[PDB]
Amino acid sequence: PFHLPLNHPTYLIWSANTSLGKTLVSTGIAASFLLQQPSSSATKLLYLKPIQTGFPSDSDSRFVFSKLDSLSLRRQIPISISNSVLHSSLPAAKSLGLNVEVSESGMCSLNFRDEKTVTGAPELLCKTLYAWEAAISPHLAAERENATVEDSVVLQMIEKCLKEEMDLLCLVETAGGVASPGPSGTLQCDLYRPFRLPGILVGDGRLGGISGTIAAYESLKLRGYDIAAVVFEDHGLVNEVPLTSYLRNKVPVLVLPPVPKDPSDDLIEWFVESDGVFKALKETMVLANLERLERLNGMAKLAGEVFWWPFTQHKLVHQETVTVIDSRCGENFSIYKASDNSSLSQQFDACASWWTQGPDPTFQAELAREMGYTAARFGHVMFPENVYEPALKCAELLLDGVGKGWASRVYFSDNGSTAIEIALKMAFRKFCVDHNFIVVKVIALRGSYHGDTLGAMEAQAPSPYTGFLQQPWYTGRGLFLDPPTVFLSNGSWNISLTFTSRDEIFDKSRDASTLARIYSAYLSKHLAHVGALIIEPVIHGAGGMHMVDPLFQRVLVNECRNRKIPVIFDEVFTGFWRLGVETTTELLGCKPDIACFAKLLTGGMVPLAVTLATDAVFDSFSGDSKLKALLHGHSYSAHAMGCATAAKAIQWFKDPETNHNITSQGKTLRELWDEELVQQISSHSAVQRVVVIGTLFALELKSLYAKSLLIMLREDGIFTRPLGNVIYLMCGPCTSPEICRRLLTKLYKRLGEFN
Amino acid sequence: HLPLNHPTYLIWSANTSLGKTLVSTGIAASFLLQQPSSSATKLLYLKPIQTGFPSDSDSRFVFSKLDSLSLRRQIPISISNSVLHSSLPAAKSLGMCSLNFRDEKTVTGAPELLCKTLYAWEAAISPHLAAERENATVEDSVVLQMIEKCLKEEMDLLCLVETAGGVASPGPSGTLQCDLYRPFRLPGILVGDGRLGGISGTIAAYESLKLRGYDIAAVVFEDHGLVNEVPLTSYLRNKVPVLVLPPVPKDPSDDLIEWFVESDGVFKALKETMVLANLERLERLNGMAKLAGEVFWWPFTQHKLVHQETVTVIDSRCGENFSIYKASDNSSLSQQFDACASWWTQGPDPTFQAELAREMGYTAARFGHVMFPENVYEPALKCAELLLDGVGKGWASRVYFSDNGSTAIEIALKMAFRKFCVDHNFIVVKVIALRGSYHGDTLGAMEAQAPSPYTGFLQQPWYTGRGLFLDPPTVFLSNGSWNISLPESFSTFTSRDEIFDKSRDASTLARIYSAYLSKHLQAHVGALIIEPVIHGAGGMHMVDPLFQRVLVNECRNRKIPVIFDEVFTGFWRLGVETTTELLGCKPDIACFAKLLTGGMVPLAVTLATDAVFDSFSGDSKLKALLHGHSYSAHAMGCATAAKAIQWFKDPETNHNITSQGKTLRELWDEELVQQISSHSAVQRVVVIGTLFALELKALYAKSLLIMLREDGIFTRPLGNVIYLMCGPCTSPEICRRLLTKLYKRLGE
Ligand SMILES: *Cc1c(COP(=O)(O)O)cnc(C)c1O
């Protein structure tokens, strides 16, 4: 979890291609910054070249160092300068003939510096972090020279350098094009993504440069980056006009004078000649950052005045507890805290943004570009009686997986609630058709949640969190039963009206058990006509992360099916790997007539909902009249955007190559939550119960402690939303068990405050 | 009318001089110099845009090398090379002038090469620059037409269209090439860069293409020894073939013929890939209608009545146009105006569609979905500010996000009823509304709708019709004159304008409205809900503005909260940003969606007064509005909405914005509407902003729909009501063409 400081501007230097002048621009910006009239000791420019090849014959760091020495003289303005190279492949080092020592990963730490100090003068610090000998792509030179550096090490090195030095301006010069591979192979635009630093883009003033520059620009935006400015060397083709036009003048486009082809040339007079451009560029960088900071510092307060947040008692919320979310990268938020030193820090989205969340960083980027493409290709196109690829693919994918062996029809809606409202309309038709029909009631389990619109509320049990002053029209339209629950406690699974293991709970033989008889009777009793059964299989989510007894639900399903009462599975929470399977029919060992999915359906990127039905449920609306039809429809039904996004997610989550958590038989995820730490936490004194399965870790505390924990977890870079006395951790389908292990660890420590 | 019987691909490149022409030549030779036989075999090579001509001619190159390879392979072929148009300068060197320029070598019964250069300039620079410098210009649509002409003129067959420069190099008019060809959305291949720095170059080019909605069947590049293909294949996740040509000979005098021969394997793979991708594409296209019938459950659709022949296969959209696939035609793609605005969501022109695409991409990459409650993030906040600074100006101070119209209504109702019970220390709460108004399909939204057959027991057994419903007077044009129609319980303006005029508060109808309403208004009425100005789903009825304002004032006098449902009306649908502009009065609560997001994605919003906001302020969390959808204020919609709110409103991005800045210029040809309203089939017309509606006299409707479609106009009937709905940025010309087609069809 990084801690990026924003007190001082730090920009990446991007280019459309290699050898367009990134280093010339860095040098120009550096000189413009350090060589101003009133020379302050406080002024410092940090220049970083994380990746270098063609070294030592090619050194951008030595170049910046060298030219600033020269310009200093020229301008008769003294400055301290230093140039260091931190690591190097063995080959490269022998070029400096250093007979150094070699790391496990073939990398060497170099004792290499050039300094020329003036005390009290402004300061240039150039650093090259890692350098290879071969003047080739970093991914290739790493191979050839057996010197490797993993992506996180590179980000750590950079973070170290930044904090080590935090007036101040920091430039980070990339290597090659925007989408050139770094050492490990990862494209540079992706490698640096976790920081999401602002940037500038050195373009191409040569014939063909307009396209080059726009493509590069677009690859950056598509990664979520911001670009303060564009700059390129003039080649007499008036390239800036098209670019400014394309940019709609929303980003300055600066044009350097033509650069000397004569290779002997100093470039000193050229720098002098380009002062105006580098000046503008520096100004643009410095301002953009202030402005970004200014906005950041005002967002919490503004939100407080302007937003009306859902499920939020505003009176109780103050600017200090509003969270400023600058961006996301996989499971991590980038949170801004001004009361800090005005910095960005990571936080694990442990609540999975209301249980929508899934994508790792890699998948987030894939989806971004599939979304862009679907936007450009389809926008929103009219659904009724039309067909279009992403809707159709998505439908096929739903039926070939989640709806396999039962569902034959797919009904699109916008969210969970709308899919439920539609499910209810399907069950009641089916039911009245089979019983030639009055007042139709639903049967459900107390604690189940099914959406917040009025239809969806009626299927929810009459609690204080659902009645008069929340919905005047709610009239408890159901028969509600109390489910048995299942929970881990003191290292052992239990039922509350001992299981050998969690798997035994799910075992289907419990049908022969005494509780199966007991259930059958209790239900048979109760079971104004009951026209539909609706459940949250396995977990009551909003109800406080309770695990219901699978046995209890299967029985109930069977009891209702025996009475020609349609069965609804509300898998808006459980669907698509939340609980370690693609559908809980895998866990309950039984099929519904109707089922609803959303949240993870779209991979946490955008709203889309779906309601799958049997051919027979489908058949109860077949008639000659448009009046028999199911006349429910939202204008954005099956919007290409969600559909495409869902088709990508359904495949990606399910695929052993894209999701390393997928089992050998590919129907389940590997266990993600460390067994030991699970057992421990389960046996702590504060903890009343634990429920753990798939991507979900929930505990209920014995309120007093709850508020404490939340804060301490946050302090630890873990963002999660309390649910009464229930505290939870919810990862994505693709989250590594190594990250879960770190979570449970932090959580267990914090309980330690409760011995 | 693009034919798909025969593959047609664009040839793209990451940069200029990477070998597009070498690849086109390779593919051509691989296709024509097939051992087998056919005189039926024909390759169409098009270079729409050429500069550096006549010293640079890609057409002459393709022609020349195929002559040579023909000999080498001892396989005869007919070849021709023509240049159609040229700048004056270029013509002299052998405005925009026509050329009678052809080279032919014909062989009887042989396969055929046809190379054509459509337009050529002399300077060797960007097409947009040479166009100014040589005063030879060609507008984008002319270029697309020229291409279309050439394709149809020749429709076994393979057609290549070689671009000029990079993916994003300007064409003659300045338009980026990736954008200029967008309306065709032809599949393509991408010649990459095997030099140092070519991995980045190639990926960026690829991504600018995808971000335009293009498909790429393959990538190819010349080997320079850097093993560039590995990163590319890995990035592409091997879902697109990456092919590697051998190094082109370094000797300048080299005829390249042996190189072509050496590269045969790569070109034949490439050709295979192109031909296959196309078959596979047409085969999916041919099976989609049927599949949809088996697999989809469409909304508001009686499936029994729908057959594969009336399912519409929509391959893509570009601004207001669908690209529709019809096998019945010529296995072809043809355009159709989305006259129904895809259930009244639609707005973006082609240019705006592309802008939004990339703003969406970026928001996806930057935010994904991030948790809303008690958090703040740029696009949510911007969007909120933009909502309050515009639509909610002078009344609204709070913004509540939801997913769609229906959810925003359900939330509005919960706000009005609290406000109402707080002011009256409160029972059974009932709504007051106008019969015909529609407010969403979820159960709360239904309750505020009047008990009709299209909303009863069959539709939702829990519907109870929880409201007092009144019959609105309506307003319509007829025989060239606007009129009012009072309902039976109740009881000719110069212009439509005379209807919205606040001078009518003093009128007699204002007095009689006040009374009629006042009576019922004296089971408590806890909220008023309306569709201002237009009852949309109700059959595009215009209500009397006067009637609604009065009603609003009557309820406000009784401390009954007022809800404006602007899910349909908001954001320029009716020529204003909000109908408070038309009704001349403010609500306490209002809902927006559909055009809110510019027709791109779902997002809804419910704006409230500070006082409505205040009735939920308490010490209890129980006291709060406990309504929330997991995707509340998803960054995606919010960003998209912030872009649309600004773009539609902005006189530079939307040329329909009036000098006042408050309204849109009339879009529907006034005399045309006159005629159509005077027609014997037509019972009434309603026209305002982006909406044209007519009702036919009490069959024929089915006829019209089909005839309109035949004319490239897609629209959805609404009873006897037929409508045309454009976007906020649609040019009045295009509307003029629509009304024309419609009027002709009535002529039947
Ligand atoms: C989240 C959820 C819903 C509602 O989904 P939204 O998209 O948030 O409206 C319905 N049922 C269950 C079980 C859920 O978890």
Ligand SMILES: *Cc1c(COP(=O)(O)O)cnc(C)c1O
């Ligand atoms: C379309 C519409 C709605 C419903 O919006 P959806 O997003 O389609 O659910 C509600 N009220 C009116 C007036 C509408 O036009």
Ligand SMILES: C[C@@H]1NC(=O)N[C@@H]1CCCCCC(=O)O
């Ligand atoms: C050489 C290509 N063939 C041609 O006729 N002109 C092209 C060159 C123009 C490309 C301009 C690139 C740019 O957009 O910057």
Ligand SMILES: C[C@@H]1NC(=O)N[C@@H]1CCCCCC(=O)O
């Ligand atoms: C020569 C540049 N300077 C440097 O240090 N390495 C760059 C070279 C590698 C970039 C090429 C990767 C690509 O093909 O995209």
